[PDB]
Design a protein around this ligand. Structure first.
Ligand SMILES: *[C@@H]1O[C@H](CO)[C@@H](O)[C@H](O)[C@H]1NC(C)=O
Lengths: 394, 147, 50
């Protein structure tokens, strides 16, 4: 049983591919083997993505795992919908209901808005990056109307990096007109470190400031720098290293040879990579539920040209979708479940705060229970008041 | 398909339209295949070669008009159809010129029950007693709002 | 260490008691805010040194 699948990995996704390989090994069975056809292309380039898709389609694949950018996302969602091809991706969730797309990344929009109310914020700065779509930006802006917030949104993305200093100085110059002390960083693991470094340089990392890293990888970045500064830093973590499941994964991951497995000799793992590993498990359980369900879907490498007109969708694809979307297993990113569209449901996102001793989970966020705080209260706080005795005498 | 079809037919230039979703496809192919693409649609957010845009950039004219009326606090109802290029414009300028902009995506409003949404829309535009609104929409979405 | 604990912001004043003020890296505590003074024996403004 040889199931051929496509793999679209953006140049530079070393740890992601390394995690993709480890998944192939951990979830390899005798019942059937997955044959990944890897294609390293510039994910941003829409044209290239189109070729890589039609190429993997002519090779006759049953499913495709890859990534997309804010620019190429429309290409994938469109083709996969027309050709009834299933596309599994750890990338940011699609802004809508696009069929034949499985998204490993849970929606953070909800967890973010809940955290803001927890700290009871009414006026804050929102530094965003247009890389993962303004889906979360619209979220905070729309909620700013209802909850009545004074949000200062600033696109920290289009900043040219070969002279990006007179821009940051002019950035926190506007964030001083209103004396902004509460900032939300909605950026990638990289753009965050750049900002964090600048923050320390200008000294805006001392007590009084409060930063919120708007990503699923709070511990993915270096925090040792703004850890002793004084400013409170909060964020979100999807990979709970306290789970015996994840703890066991790291035990083998941290030992792997960094030569064969690039950027894999660490005690931690980027949430993007962790989702890639969980993606393999989903594809395995999906193709397995098709064998046990007595469903024939097999074909050959003659699907033909994807530009074929009229384009006829192979009916066997409809079943492959109902398989992946029906999958429900336990992975590094907590309980994995899907709806009819492909968006993850019944998941859990741990809310993190950065203390002196390091990061610490102060609670979690459920799509049905909102935010729920867990034990951690430093009870008490010198509450030991003073007992004053007195007599009733006018 | 329509692009590759017209390309196989051996054309010298292509005139058409694109959406916020298909725009990347056109700009990419036309750049790779060195095919010229003339379009009246919204200008591309960047410098994409082999693309001729008939529509001038309104971003500039809008910002200038705001200062003319001397606006400091206004509501900005936008539609994600023509890209948030102008939205980013007013938001970025809101930092410099110090404006209190209330941006609201009036696009994702489902039209088969779009009434309890408008009532809840001007309910938020009443918390701050917004009297100055900017409608960044198509000729159609504008009439709906105006009505 | 000063930068780490954040004692390099406005309000602090350091004096480097050596003849090599520009000999060390100052780009780090340069934008901090705290005033830093010192001593220089090698004048790079002299045509001789230049
Ligand atoms: C929802 O998720 C929880 C936590 O993983 C799980 O225990 C439960 O079975 C799920 N609910 C259903 C009905 O699938």
């Amino acid at each position: 049983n040889s199931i051929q699948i496509g793999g679209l990995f953006p140049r530079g996704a070393d740890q992601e591919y390394s995690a993709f390989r480890v998944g192939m090994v951990q979830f390899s069975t005798s019942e059937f083997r997955l044959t990944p056809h890897i294609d390293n292309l510039e994910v941003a380039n829409s044209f290239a993505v189109t070729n890589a898709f039609c190429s993997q389609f002519s090779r006759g694949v049953y499913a495709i795992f890859g990534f997309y950018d804010k620019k190429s996302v429309n290409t994938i969602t469109s083709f996969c919908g027309t050709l009834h091809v299933s596309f599994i991706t750890p990338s940011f969730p699609t802004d809508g209901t696009h069929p034949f797309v499985i998204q490993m990344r849970p929606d953070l929009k909800g967890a973010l808005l809940s955290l803001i109310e927890y700290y009871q914020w009414d006026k804050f700065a929102y530094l965003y990056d247009s890389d993962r779509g303004l889906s979360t930006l619209q979220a905070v802006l729309d909620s700013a109307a209802e909850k009545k917030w004074q949000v200062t949104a600033i696109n920290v993305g289009n900043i040219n990096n070969d002279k990006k200093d007179e821009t940051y100085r002019s950035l926190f110059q506007d964030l001083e007109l209103k004396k902004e002390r509460r900032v939300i960083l909605d950026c990638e693991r990289d753009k965050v470190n750049d900002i964090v470094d600048q923050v320390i340089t200008i000294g805006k990392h001392v007590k009084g400031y409060h930063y919120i890293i708007a990503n699923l990888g709070f511990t993915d970045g270096d925090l040792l720098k703004i850890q002793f500064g004084g400013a409170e830093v909060s964020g979100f973590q999807i990979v709970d290293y306290d789970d015996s499941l994840v703890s066991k994964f790291i035990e083998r991951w941290s030992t792997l040879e960094e030569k064969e497995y690039p950027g894999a000799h660490t005690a931690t793992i980027k949430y993007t990579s962790a989702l890639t590993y969980d993606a393999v498990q989903v594809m395995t359980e999906a193709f397995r539920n098709l064998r046990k369900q007595r469903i024939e879907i097999s074909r050959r490498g003659n699907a033909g040209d994807c530009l074929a007109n009229p384009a006829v969708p192979w009916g066997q694809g409809v079943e492959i979708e109902r398989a992946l979307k029906q999958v429900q297993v336990e992975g590094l990113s907590g309980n994995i479940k899907f709806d009819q569209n492909g968006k993850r449901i019944n998941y859990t996102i741990n809310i993190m705060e950065l203390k002196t001793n390091g990061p610490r989970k102060i609670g979690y966020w459920s799509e049905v229970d909102k935010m729920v705080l867990t034990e951690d209260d430093t009870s008490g706080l010198e509450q030991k008041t003073v007992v004053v005795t007195t007599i009733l005498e006018s």
